[PDB]
Amino acid sequence: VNSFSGYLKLTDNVYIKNADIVEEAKKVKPTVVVNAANVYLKHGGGVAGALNKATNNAMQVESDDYIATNGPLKVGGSCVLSGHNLAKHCLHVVGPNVNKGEDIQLLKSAYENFNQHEVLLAPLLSAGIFGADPIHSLRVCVDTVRTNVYLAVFDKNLYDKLVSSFL
Ligand SMILES: O=C(O)c1cncc(-c2ccccc2)c1
């Protein structure tokens, strides 16, 4: 049994809710919240900007030190950093950004990072300002992630379309 409330069950392991991921993280304090990260961990917009704002920029400060030591992530890669006031840990995952011309096949690689964590609160990778089709992102999620994932979708309209169209 876990804390997550109000989710629709899509599969054995994937759940979905119309929710503001910062507000959900603040309520649940999950072990892992996933950030929609980029290679230089610059949390300025989309999910990264909202999560970082909710940490009063502490996520960005920590991330800048991580990059100064380790260099950029790979597209499709991830790192584990603090969850600050939102979660125990933040899994920063880099989905491909279609608005930069990145290969959408890297979306499956991105989702594979979730399998290293038994339970996660996450957004749909590569959705929003990353430019991918969220319907496609949900399909890759269901077909790739085997651990228990609780998806928060910001737009009510999009949430209803994702559920109605789910095979
Ligand atoms: O649900 C998403 O895929 C999503 C994409 N871009 C931004 C957001 C967002 C926007 C404001 C607050 C918290 C999350 C969610």
From Swiss-Prot:
Changing S164L: In strain: Gamma/P.1. Residues 1-167 form the Macro domain. It is found in: Host endoplasmic reticulum membrane. Signal peptide: none annotated. It catalyses: Thiol-dependent hydrolysis of ester, thioester, amide, peptide and isopeptide bonds formed by the C-terminal Gly of ubiquitin (a 76-residue protein attached to proteins as an intracellular targeting signal). Inhibited in vitro by GRL-0617. It is a multi-pass membrane protein. Responsible for the cleavages located at the N-terminus of the replicase polyprotein. Participates together with nsp4 in the assembly of virally-induced cytoplasmic double-membrane vesicles necessary for viral replication. Antagonizes innate immune induction of type I interferon by blocking the phosphorylation, dimerization and subsequent nuclear translocation of host IRF3. Also prevents host NF-kappa-B signaling. In addition, PL-PRO possesses a deubiquitinating/deISGylating activity and processes both 'Lys-48'- and 'Lys-63'-linked polyubiquitin chains from cellular substrates. May form homohexamers. Interacts with N protein. This is Papain-like protease nsp3. The gene is rep.
